[PDB]
Scaffold this active site. Structure first.
Site, PDB file in Angstrom:
ATOM      1  N   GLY A   9       0.294  12.074  -1.162  1.00 18.56           N
ATOM      2  CA  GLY A   9       1.433  11.716  -0.222  1.00 18.56           C
ATOM      3  C   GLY A   9       2.396  12.676   0.519  1.00 18.56           C
ATOM      4  O   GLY A   9       2.316  13.819  -0.225  1.00 18.56           O
ATOM      5  N   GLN A  10       3.178  12.643   0.952  1.00 18.29           N
ATOM      6  CA  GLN A  10       4.360  13.303   1.761  1.00 18.29           C
ATOM      7  C   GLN A  10       4.909  14.325   0.799  1.00 18.29           C
ATOM      8  O   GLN A  10       4.777  15.540  -0.090  1.00 18.29           O
ATOM      9  CB  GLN A  10       4.997  13.163   2.800  1.00 18.29           C
ATOM     10  CG  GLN A  10       6.698  14.199   2.833  1.00 18.29           C
ATOM     11  CD  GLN A  10       7.147  13.427   3.962  1.00 18.29           C
ATOM     12  OE1 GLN A  10       7.806  12.176   3.714  1.00 18.29           O
ATOM     13  NE2 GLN A  10       6.913  14.211   5.148  1.00 18.29           N
ATOM     14  N   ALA A  72      -1.112   7.907   8.769  1.00 20.58           N
ATOM     15  CA  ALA A  72      -0.076   7.600   7.248  1.00 20.58           C
ATOM     16  C   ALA A  72      -0.022   6.459   6.691  1.00 20.58           C
ATOM     17  O   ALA A  72      -1.011   5.559   6.224  1.00 20.58           O
ATOM     18  CB  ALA A  72       1.026   8.445   7.106  1.00 20.58           C
ATOM     19  N   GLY A 116       4.574   4.540  -1.385  1.00 20.19           N
ATOM     20  CA  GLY A 116       4.315   5.230   0.060  1.00 20.19           C
ATOM     21  C   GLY A 116       2.627   4.673   0.373  1.00 20.19           C
ATOM     22  O   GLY A 116       2.150   4.073  -0.137  1.00 20.19           O
ATOM     23  N   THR A 152      13.128   2.728  -0.532  1.00 22.11           N
ATOM     24  CA  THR A 152      12.923   3.318   1.042  1.00 22.11           C
ATOM     25  C   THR A 152      12.370   3.039   1.521  1.00 22.11           C
ATOM     26  O   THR A 152      12.874   1.765   3.245  1.00 22.11           O
ATOM     27  CB  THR A 152      12.857   4.740   1.487  1.00 22.11           C
ATOM     28  OG1 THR A 152      13.435   5.965   0.631  1.00 22.11           O
ATOM     29  CG2 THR A 152      12.083   5.507   3.046  1.00 22.11           C
ATOM     30  N   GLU A 156       7.630  -1.328   0.002  1.00 19.61           N
ATOM     31  CA  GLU A 156       7.792  -0.182  -1.259  1.00 19.61           C
ATOM     32  C   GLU A 156       7.266  -0.994  -2.501  1.00 19.61           C
ATOM     33  O   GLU A 156       6.134   0.050  -3.060  1.00 19.61           O
ATOM     34  CB  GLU A 156       9.065   0.364  -1.973  1.00 19.61           C
ATOM     35  CG  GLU A 156       9.777   1.480  -3.413  1.00 19.61           C
ATOM     36  CD  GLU A 156       9.808   2.035  -3.454  1.00 19.61           C
ATOM     37  OE1 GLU A 156       9.345   3.422  -2.933  1.00 19.61           O
ATOM     38  OE2 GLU A 156      10.941   2.244  -4.023  1.00 19.61           O
ATOM     39  N   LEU A 225      -3.145  19.447 -23.538  1.00 22.93           N
ATOM     40  CA  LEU A 225      -3.199  18.329 -22.042  1.00 22.93           C
ATOM     41  C   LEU A 225      -3.642  16.703 -23.064  1.00 22.93           C
ATOM     42  O   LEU A 225      -2.660  15.913 -23.165  1.00 22.93           O
ATOM     43  CB  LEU A 225      -4.235  18.055 -20.763  1.00 22.93           C
ATOM     44  CG  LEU A 225      -3.365  19.277 -19.511  1.00 22.93           C
ATOM     45  CD1 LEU A 225      -4.086  19.134 -18.939  1.00 22.93           C
ATOM     46  CD2 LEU A 225      -2.239  18.887 -19.901  1.00 22.93           C
ATOM     47  N   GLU A 227      -3.651  16.451 -26.390  1.00 19.12           N
ATOM     48  CA  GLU A 227      -2.756  16.151 -26.928  1.00 19.12           C
ATOM     49  C   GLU A 227      -1.408  15.854 -26.672  1.00 19.12           C
ATOM     50  O   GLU A 227      -1.274  14.329 -27.259  1.00 19.12           O
ATOM     51  CB  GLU A 227      -1.496  18.153 -27.486  1.00 19.12           C
ATOM     52  CG  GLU A 227      -2.045  18.922 -28.051  1.00 19.12           C
ATOM     53  CD  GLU A 227      -1.916  19.405 -29.138  1.00 19.12           C
ATOM     54  OE1 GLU A 227      -0.827  19.299 -29.700  1.00 19.12           O
ATOM     55  OE2 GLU A 227      -2.701  19.686 -30.101  1.00 19.12           O
TER      56      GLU A 227
HETATM   57  N1  GTP Z   1      10.940  13.662  -5.716  1.00 19.09           N
HETATM   58  C1  GTP Z   1      11.351  13.536  -4.015  1.00 19.09           C
HETATM   59  N2  GTP Z   1      10.648  11.931  -4.099  1.00 19.09           N
HETATM   60  C2  GTP Z   1      10.440  12.648  -2.798  1.00 19.09           C
HETATM   61  C3  GTP Z   1       9.684  13.183  -1.764  1.00 19.09           C
HETATM   62  N3  GTP Z   1       9.954  12.780  -0.527  1.00 19.09           N
HETATM   63  C4  GTP Z   1       9.943  11.574  -0.677  1.00 19.09           C
HETATM   64  N4  GTP Z   1       9.908  10.900  -1.844  1.00 19.09           N
HETATM   65  C5  GTP Z   1      10.054   9.387  -2.024  1.00 19.09           C
HETATM   66  O1  GTP Z   1       8.975   8.919  -1.922  1.00 19.09           O
HETATM   67  C6  GTP Z   1       8.873   8.046  -1.736  1.00 19.09           C
HETATM   68  C7  GTP Z   1       8.810   7.519  -0.036  1.00 19.09           C
HETATM   69  O2  GTP Z   1       7.003   7.761   0.124  1.00 19.09           O
HETATM   70  P1  GTP Z   1       6.574   8.481   2.291  1.00 19.09           P
HETATM   71  O3  GTP Z   1       7.118   9.883   2.161  1.00 19.09           O
HETATM   72  O4  GTP Z   1       7.205   7.248   2.647  1.00 19.09           O
HETATM   73  O5  GTP Z   1       5.361   8.132   2.116  1.00 19.09           O
HETATM   74  P2  GTP Z   1       3.962   8.712   1.141  1.00 19.09           P
HETATM   75  O6  GTP Z   1       4.039   8.336  -0.214  1.00 19.09           O
HETATM   76  O7  GTP Z   1       4.038   9.875   1.169  1.00 19.09           O
HETATM   77  O8  GTP Z   1       2.592   8.722   2.336  1.00 19.09           O
HETATM   78  P3  GTP Z   1       2.716   7.994   3.742  1.00 19.09           P
HETATM   79  O9  GTP Z   1       3.290   6.135   3.699  1.00 19.09           O
HETATM   80  O10 GTP Z   1       1.671   7.172   4.346  1.00 19.09           O
HETATM   81  O11 GTP Z   1       3.506   9.078   4.296  1.00 19.09           O
HETATM   82  C8  GTP Z   1      10.514   7.593  -2.011  1.00 19.09           C
HETATM   83  O12 GTP Z   1      10.538   7.005  -2.247  1.00 19.09           O
HETATM   84  C9  GTP Z   1      11.038   8.684  -1.613  1.00 19.09           C
HETATM   85  O13 GTP Z   1      12.272   8.640  -1.972  1.00 19.09           O
HETATM   86  C10 GTP Z   1      10.235  14.282  -2.581  1.00 19.09           C
HETATM   87  O14 GTP Z   1      10.302  15.449  -1.570  1.00 19.09           O
HETATM   88  N5  GTP Z   1      10.926  14.635  -4.050  1.00 19.09           N
HETATM   89 MG    MG Z   2       4.191  11.395   4.333  1.00 14.19          MG
END
Ligand code: GTP
Ligand code: MG
Ligand code: TA1
Ligand code: GDP
Ligand code: ZN
Lengths: 412, 153, 182, 426, 182, 153
Positions: A9-10, A72, A116, A152, A156, A225, A227
């Site tokens: 995931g991103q 995505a 996500g 977001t 969710e 791990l 552990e």
């Molecule tokens: N700690 C942290 N949380 C993040 C970051 N990027 C996104 N999030 C959180 O992870 C969720 C976002 O997921 P997305 O970026 O929408 O999606 P994805 O899980 O990458 O996959 P897709 O929906 O298919 O794009 C939200 O709850 C964000 O607050 C990051 O770099 N750090």
């Molecule tokens: Mg993404």
């Protein structure tokens, strides 16, 4: 001995780039040194591309960077079933090609973002296909579950009640770091209303370094791990402990840095420092793995902990006499050259299973219903190879996770 | 144990023609009978077969014995069709020349054994068709002579 | 069949369940010693002996395959028509505090199947077929009889036809010295 | 990923010139020139809107559909007009009569095949297609009729790729046409059942927002258009840029449409301050949400304050704190719990690009799915009946091979569409 | 047939509809479990099983083609004479809050067709044809009889003609020893 | 199943000549009978055929059975012609030598099957014409001898 890692995931990839940064940083391996030991998955090219364009560009093999130019979709279904499917094979291939090359491994540290599309769905089947191909290992998935009020995606919960039920019967230990509850730490314990995602990442990027990095690293009280899951999960549910760090002091403002053990350990149980909006509102701890690093005298610990064991207001489960896995490492932490992390000579990355999440899950489950109760964005999944089944039947799933986290505690 | 008349492919065609109907038959494929038979597909076949031969309905597979004395009758209806299905197959399969039928055949089917059973049923079904013709011809003869009675009184 | 009608989290009901299991095992010659005490939190090894025993009343001489019980036991409850899914992880922790109530409940339901099935081996009609047969009880008798003959190498069915005509004369008072005597 | 714009009718066309006027500069593409891009990032994702042929000629991948030559011959004879490959111009020298029926059944129906032809040449361009952008006005022939057909065909050819629709719903106060509700009701009908994301703009919601939120005293059309085009750039193109948290048409779609109707949104831009003076820079962020979420500033006619929201998508694009963003959104969700619907714990869909609008420091496109837009289709639907009842200028439709049951159909449909939308306001 | 006479947005009437559907399914041996609860917002998958069942009472052994149900189901309601159009998008969201009331209404109307059609298979004249036939019931009998003969290779129709003349003598008292005895 | 006497082109001509009238026949074309038959065109043909043969009117296709017990009688009239059409075609098609007619033939027609049916009807229609001549000749003979009766009394 080793532990592969699959950043999905991103987000899991942004956090990945971060945790991956802190690494070389404390191992003296600049931009271009050795070779990582993980992979990167996403159904949105532009993000993994950031690892292909930005920093730590050539420290990876275009082979451990999987992408699906396609779409995505912030929806489980599509990412798990429909689209996400096409890539999985290929994905696996690396975690089977990278899993072979090594020498007697221990597991795969998975990095995903619960709510996500590519993070919830996909992994769901990635971890899924792992539990079968290597049931004989550790599956510790490091998640970033849904901000309690500051979510977001509009859906969710759909995506997180679904990544939980599908992964539940496949993970070993699921670490959890709450995106919002980390902001508090950036506001209250570091002071900054300018926290870029790039920071939260530096943070988990820290707590995580305390898990694998240093632990798999020699010390006065090593902790494998395995552990963890052993000393950390009382029951098969891929139980989810919480990550917490101690010296989260600001490298500019205040400076009392020299905060002997006796202090940094007490700073773990105060709810305002745990990377999770699961304030011990009642949740009785049932096992904590106090991973220390830096200059620490075992007595200091086998005392600082003793003092705690008798604070009572910290009530530990009944069926648990002693639930304190003391993990001592040598090398102190390693803060980014000039981010905003203090830089002490000792820290406490304590993680644990707390009857507390009885909440966090609750509050996240309820969410789900409200929408499902009206089908809200349901047509988005159905039309993606899912059914009234998978939802309703994954709801019932977590239901017994609200009862589980209730029964294993609150009762004697 | 002689050899089954039909292999799985032929067995499907005979079940479509003679036992299953519309969607049910159209959905029926080799792979849900071999190499591992989907017990719920066999359930449907065995049940429809019984209906055709004994003139019996879905409802009859939900009859609860009177001296059972269970505590939650409504929780048991998932089991009733199995129990009844077994009780009738006990009587029917010997007719189709199968004497070694067992409860595990429904709950946990084997490829070869169940293809032997379906052949025996399919065989018998072809034979009663031949008998139907003879029977209905006699029946038409006697109910037509019972008419030439009331048409003569 | 959707929402469980049973008080699974009432101590007395779970105790009632254990009692029924204990009683049934003892009264049906179960080879290993059992007691109200020994059944509060059975080991998986125990559960599998108990399950194997109970299921053997339905599948004589049954033994569970040597691996993948966590898949098998739930599959069997499903194929028997148990309205409630038993999870893979239930199976590894059957005796655990929040798990045994569901499992003992399932075993007692199985015992109830045994009861139903045993009664069925005593007592529990279709006069017309849905492909145009009238007096099916007469046709089936005829058809079965023809089949035995056929299966003996017989080419014709005079005995069976003759007997069929005897019964058809009695079903509609009619012959020759009746239809032409008039 | 990719998309293929569609300039249906004159309006939809006139706007094309403005949407491309902008977008290009937001991608350093001079008339026929190439990528002069002040940066290097305005290129790694261009594909979404262009094609590689020469090496300095990245041609916009849109379609120009219209039955009135003069129009496209004004767009093709002016500024950026000479960047579209002639193949793009699908004209209909016929009589572009102002009849929905004349551009959907009789006149347009012919020119269609010669369009679909190209819409396929562009779709089968390369890589992977995402969806198509559609601009037009629901108050004319080549717009509502012929453009509403173009989609009904598109959505049969790729029920997979998305369909954003930018409609210039008939402004209230004064109608720039007479049958308006006829050409409209008939096109909305087609919309509620093909495209799956519609952004309704109102020439007078703009004036207002352009004469009081921009002390602009002489808001020419070019302007309105310009403002609109500003929003559609924040939407698409934008998200096809990096970001801490980026989304893309689908996310936008899969987070904004609770129920399949397709639902229509109402776009709103962020920094909307008058030139000199106003250049207050009060753009820390609370200032952008202050903006975006107010009544005025909603390109739509209706006012949000008149009906809950189902979804919201603040697609910001300028370096900011995922904290001061994620946070603000909340208070906003609590100060106005009243109107924001409840059965959705987090209506808002925070999106965050990085690079901002070329010359600005921080912006944020707003795409609201509020139940307020009920009070617009109502409007339209009313105007219809009041005139349908007397079959007003109906002979211009029927006489063009139409049906007395066709008008009935649309109204009802679109009329029911009003109904449903209320099912959530409650 | 134009404006729906039915109170589709009255909760009680929609509840009445669901009850009728539930009752009908249960009482006609529908294979899957249904309840007032399970029918409040069915899945499309469910709806299609229910529709297929109901329609099978009219088209025995019917299965809907494996794709394009959103086109088919509405087409069938149209061809059956349902006065109200069912939209393509209704079909994708049948169970949705503002949609199910229209669809359940349609299913219950279909059930009513079944009732009408089943009664029709019990009981529900034309003595003169519009091409100049008088005593059509006599002509048809004659014509049918001639056809059977013809269809058997017969070249002439004396049997049929003779029988026709017998009946024509009785319809108008007339022959030879009557018309010439006078 | 022998081969139909006529292909679609010929079938249209015979329907024009013998079954449909004025506008109705003039509108009738090959493409609304093959390769996919417009069920509402067949409805008209099958209905007119029945009218001609049984001396029956449009109104008879709207008869509501008495023991139906429907809640909204007026909402059901779209269905009545279908139900009745089917009930009569049940009796008529066997006469035209068609025994395998099914409800789906009206609701969902197939090219070949419906061209077989229309041939069977068209054939029978040619035959009853031949019978009409014979019949009307006998009828004229007896109603003329019933006149020479009253002209003699
Ligand atoms: N700690 C942290 N949380 C993040 C970051 N990027 C996104 N999030 C959180 O992870 C969720 C976002 O997921 P997305 O970026 O929408 O999606 P994805 O899980 O990458 O996959 P897709 O929906 O298919 O794009 C939200 O709850 C964000 O607050 C990051 O770099 N750090
Ligand atoms: Mg993404
Ligand atoms: C010296 C300086 O800073 O000038 C600014 C400026 O004064 C202001 C007033 C601009 C100005 O915009 C307008 O006056 C305007 C005119 C018609 C319709 C709508 C707006 C500006 O013209 C617009 C221009 O916008 C951009 O450069 C963006 O990249 C924008 N571009 C276009 O709209 C565009 C215009 C002409 C040709 C090609 C593109 C954009 C926005 C979203 C998505 C993509 C691109 C900016 C910052 C300014 C000027 C130049 C004065 C403002 O608008 C925008 C869209 O940024 C109006 O309120 C904001 C606040 C800005 O500070
Ligand atoms: N914003 C905006 N609206 C326009 C433009 N041109 C026409 N319109 C609007 O479009 C409507 C008229 O339809 P028109 O575009 O002439 O139809 P067509 O050309 O026959 O397809 C009126 O409501 C106008 O306000 C324009 O360049 N910008
Ligand atoms: Zn100090």
């Amino acid at each position: 001995r080793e532990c592969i890692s699959i950043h999905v995931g991103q987000a899991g990839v942004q956090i990945g780039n971060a945790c991956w940064e802190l690494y070389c940083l404390e191992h003296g391996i600049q931009p271009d040194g050795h070779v990582p030991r993980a992979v990167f998955v996403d159904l949105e090219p532009t993000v993994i591309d950031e690892v292909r364009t930005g920093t730590y560009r050539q420290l990876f093999h275009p082979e451990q960077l999987i992408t699906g130019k396609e779409d995505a979709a912030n929806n489980y279904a599509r990412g798990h079933y429909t689209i996400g499917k096409e890539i999985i094979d290929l994905v696996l291939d690396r975690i089977r090609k990278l899993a072979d090359q090594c020498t007697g491994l221990q597991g795969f540290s998975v990095f995903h973002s619960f709510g996500g599309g590519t993070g919830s769905g996909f992994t769901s089947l990635l971890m899924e296909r792992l539990s079968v191909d290597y049931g004989k290992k550790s599956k510790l998935e490091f998640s970033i579950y849904p901000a309690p009020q500051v979510s977001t995606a509009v859906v969710e919960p759909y995506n997180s009640i679904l990544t939980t039920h599908t992964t539940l019967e496949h993970s070993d230990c699921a670490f959890m770091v709450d995106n919002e509850a980390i902001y508090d730490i950036c506001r209250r314990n570091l002071d900054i209303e300018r926290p870029t995602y790039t920071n939260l990442n530096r943070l988990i990027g820290q707590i995580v370094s305390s898990i694998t990095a240093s632990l798999r690293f020699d010390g006065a009280l090593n902790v494998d791990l395995t552990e963890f899951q052993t000393n950390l999960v009382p029951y098969p549910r891929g139980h989810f402990p919480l990550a917490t760090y101690a010296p989260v002091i600001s490298a500019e403002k205040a400076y009392h840095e020299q905060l002997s053990v006796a202090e940094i350990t007490n700073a773990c149980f105060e709810p305002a420092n745990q990377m999770v909006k699961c304030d011990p509102r009642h949740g009785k701890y049932m096992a904590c793995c106090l991973l220390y690093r830096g200059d620490v005298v075992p007595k200091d610990v086998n005392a600082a902990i003793a003092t705690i064991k008798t604070k009572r207001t910290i009530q530990f489960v009944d069926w648990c006499p002693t639930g304190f896995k003391v993990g001592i490492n040598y090398e102190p932490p390693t803060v980014v050259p000039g981010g905003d992390l203090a830089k002490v000579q000792r820290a406490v990355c304590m993680l644990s299973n707390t009857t507390a999440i009885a909440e966090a899950w609750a509050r996240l489950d309820h969410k789900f219903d409200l929408m499902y109760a009206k089908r809200a964005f349901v047509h988005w999944y159905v039309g993606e190879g899912m059914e009234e089944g998978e939802f309703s039947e994954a709801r019932e799933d977590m239901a017994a996770l609200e009862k589980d986290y209730e029964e294993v505690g609150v009762d004697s | 144990l002689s050899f089954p008349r039909y292999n799985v492919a032929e067995i499907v065609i005979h079940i479509r023609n003679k036992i299953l109907t519309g969607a049910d038959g159209k959905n029926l494929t080799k792979n849900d009978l071999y190499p591992n038979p989907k017990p719920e597909v066999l359930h449907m076949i065995y049940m429809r077969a019984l209906q055709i031969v004994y003139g019996i309905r879905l409802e009859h597979f939900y009859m609860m014995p009177v001296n059972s004395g269970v505590m939650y009758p409504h929780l048991m209806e998932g089991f009733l069709p199995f129990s009844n299905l077994v009780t009738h197959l006990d009587s029917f399969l010997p007719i189709c020349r199968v004497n070694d039928f067992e409860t595990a055949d429904i709950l946990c089917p084997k490829a070869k054994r169940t293809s032997r059973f379906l052949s025996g049923i399919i065989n018998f079904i072809h034979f009663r068709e031949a008998c139907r013709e003879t029977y209905m011809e006699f029946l038409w003869q006697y109910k037509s002579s019972a008419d030439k009675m009331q048409q003569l009184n | 069949m959707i929402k469980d009608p049973r008080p699974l989290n009432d101590k007395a009901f779970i105790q009632q369940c254990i009692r029924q299991l204990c009683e049934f095992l003892t009264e049906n010659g179960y080879a290993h010693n059992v007691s109200m005490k020994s059944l509060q939190a059975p080991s998986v090894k125990d559960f599998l002996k108990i399950f194997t025993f109970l299921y053997g009343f339905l599948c004589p001489s049954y033994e569970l395959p040597d691996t993948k019980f966590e898949e098998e036991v739930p599959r069997i409850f499903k194929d028997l028509g148990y309205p409630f899914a038993l999870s893979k992880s239930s199976m590894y922790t059957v005796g655990a505090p929040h798990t045994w109530p569901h499992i003992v409940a399932a075993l007692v339901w199985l015992i109830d199947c045994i009861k139903i099935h045993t009664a069925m081996k005593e007592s529990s009609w279709g006069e017309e077929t849905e492909d145009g047969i009238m007096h099916n009880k007469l046709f089936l008798d005829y058809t079965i009889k023809c089949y035995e003959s056929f299966m003996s190498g017989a080419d014709s069915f005079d005995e069976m036809n003759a007997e069929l005509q005897s019964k058809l004369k009695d079903l509609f008072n009619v012959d020759a010295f009746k239809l032409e005597s008039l | 990923r990719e998309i293929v714009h569609i300039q249906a009718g004159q309006c939809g066309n006139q706007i094309g010139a403005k949407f491309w006027e902008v977008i290009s500069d937001e991608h350093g593409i001079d008339p026929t020139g190439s990528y002069h891009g002040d940066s290097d990032l305005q290129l790694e994702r261009i594909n979404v809107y262009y094609n590689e042929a020469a090496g300095n000629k990245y041609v916009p991948r849109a379609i120009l559909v219209d039955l009135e030559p003069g129009t496209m011959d004004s767009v093709r004879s002016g500024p950026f007009g000479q960047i579209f490959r002639p193949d793009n111009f699908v004209f209909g020298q016929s009589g572009a009569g102002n009849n929905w029926a004349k551009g959907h059944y009789t006149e347009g129906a012919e020119l269609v095949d010669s369009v679909l032809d190209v819409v396929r040449k562009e779709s089968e361009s390369c890589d992977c297609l995402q969806g198509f952008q559609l601009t037009h006005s629901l108050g004319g022939g080549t717009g509502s009729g012929m453009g509403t057909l173009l989609i009904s065909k598109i959505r049969e050819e790729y029920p997979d790729r998305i369909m954003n629709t930018f409609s210039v719903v008939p402004s209230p106060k004064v109608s720039d046409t007479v049958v308006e509700p006829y050409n409209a009701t008939l096109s909305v009908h087609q919309l509620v059942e093909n495209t799956d994301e519609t952004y309704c703009i109102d020439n007078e919601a703009l004036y207002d927002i352009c004469f009081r939120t921009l002390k602009l005293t002489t808001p020419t059309y070019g302007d309105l258009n310009h403002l609109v085009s500003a929003t559609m750039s924040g939407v698409t193109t934008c998200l096809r840029f990096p970001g801490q948290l980026n989304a893309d048409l689908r996310k936008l779609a899969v987070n904004m449409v609770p129920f399949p109707r397709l639902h229509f949104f109402m776009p709103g831009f962020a920094p909307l301050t008058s030139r000199g003076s106003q250049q207050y820079r009060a753009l820390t962020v609370p200032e952008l949400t202050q903006q975006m979420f107010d009544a005025k500033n909603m390109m739509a006619a209706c006012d949000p304050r008149h009906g809950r929201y189902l979804t919201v998508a603040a697609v910001f694009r300028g370096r900011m704190s995922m904290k001061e963003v994620d946070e603000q959104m909340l208070n906003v969700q609590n100060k106005n719990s009243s109107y924001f619907v409840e059965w959705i714990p987090n209506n808002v869909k925070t999106a965050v690009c990085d690079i901002p609008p070329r010359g600005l420091k921080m912006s944020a496109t707003f795409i609201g799915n509020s139940t307020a837009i009920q009070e617009l289709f109502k409007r339209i639907s009313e105007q219809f009946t009041a005139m349908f009842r007397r079959k007003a200028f109906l002979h211009w439709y029927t006489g063009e091979g139409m049906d007395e049951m066709e008008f009935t159909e649309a109204e009802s449909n679109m009329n029911d569409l009003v109904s449903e939308y209320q099912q959530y306001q409650d």
